[PDB]
């Protein structure tokens, strides 16, 4: 039996789908795992790892992050509020990266993906840090289709958490670039009702959300710094079997609460 798992199973049954959770206490090595190795659509959440890959490239291409990109109107797609606002100005690669992370800007994500050689390029970066699960296959907006059983544009809660740790706390990025990634995550604007809602207000959080919407499909991943303790890294993903099934932020927050509670 798995008593630790029963509250999660209860939660996803009330929800009407599947919830996937993985949390790592980087001090103790303790973990909390629920459907941790099943695939879930990435939706917008891929944009965190996208920003990381751009940061890694900027270590080896001098002035890359400072480079202005003067994109045209044909680079724009729905829900690109920052990219639209800066259309007549242009944006640096840094600014695009922060827009992708902190506002989930779609156009900014597509412009950066192009710089890396498209979804296959981001996938190759993820492989280079030892992540064999992550895959990005399509661009915005098609990557959000979230069709049950389609492996395209998916990862697992465990692989996400493991890769997040490597990039934010490990050595996969050089220190200045690691700190930039952490700062982008900390300044995220879209995650207030997800993992941030599960966390004491005095603990620092950096996160990135995803919301495909269809098939009850949404997610959040985070690094959490509890006051006086090593950081906790975690990922919460949801999906559901019917196209009209509605995602729930509350369910992502409740799952996060159970992970933090289950840790030692
Ligand atoms: C990503 O899943 N999305 C981008 C945008 N904001 O969502 S997020 O903050 O939950 O990441 C709208 C939904 C979506 C998309 N359809 O591109």
Residue numbers in the entry: 26 to 289
Q: Would you copy out the relevant sentences from the publication that reported this structure?
A:
KPC-2 hydrolyzes clavulanic acid, is phenotypically resistant to inhibitors and bacteria expressing this class A β-lactamase represent a major global health threat. The inhibition of KPC-2 by avibactam differs from the inhibition of other β-lactamases; avibactam, in addition to reversible deacylation, undergoes a slow desulfation. When bound to KPC-2, avibactam makes hydrogen bonds via its carbonyl oxygen in the oxyanion hole (comprised of backbone nitrogen atoms of S70 and T237), via the amide moiety with N132, and via its sulfate moiety with residues S130, T237, T235, and the main chain oxygen of T235. Residue W105, located 4.4 Å away is providing modest van der Waals interactions with the C4 atom of avibactam. In addition, K234 is potentially making a long range hydrogen bond electrostatic interaction with the sulfate moiety of avibactam with a distance of slightly greater than 3.3Å (not shown in Fig 4 due to cut-off 3.2Å distance used). The observed presence of the covalent bond involving S70 as well as the hydrogen bonding network between S130 and K73, and K234 and S70 are all conserved in CTX-M-15, SHV-1, and KPC-2 although the distance between S130 and K73 is somewhat larger in KPC-2 (3.35 Å) compared to the 2.8 Å and 3.1 Å distances observed in CTX-M-15 and SHV-1, respectively. The KPC-2:avibactam structure aids in explaining the structural basis of engineered substitutions that were shown to lead to resistance to this inhibitor against KPC-2. The second residue that impacts avibactam inhibition in KPC-2 is K234R. This change (K →R) has an intermediate effect on ampicillin/avibactam resistance; this side chain is hydrogen bonding to S130 in the KPC-2:avibactam structure. R220M is the third amino acid substitution in KPC-2 that has a modest effect on MIC (32 mg/L) compared to the other two changes. This is anticipated since this residue is not within hydrogen bonding distance of avibactam in the acyl complex structure, it is positioned more than 4 Å from the sulfate moiety, but could still have a significant electrostatic interaction with the negatively charged avibactam group. The chirality of N1 of avibactam is likely S in KPC-2 although the 1.8Å resolution of this structure is not sufficient to assign this chirality with 100% confidence; in the other β-lactamases, it is either R or planar.
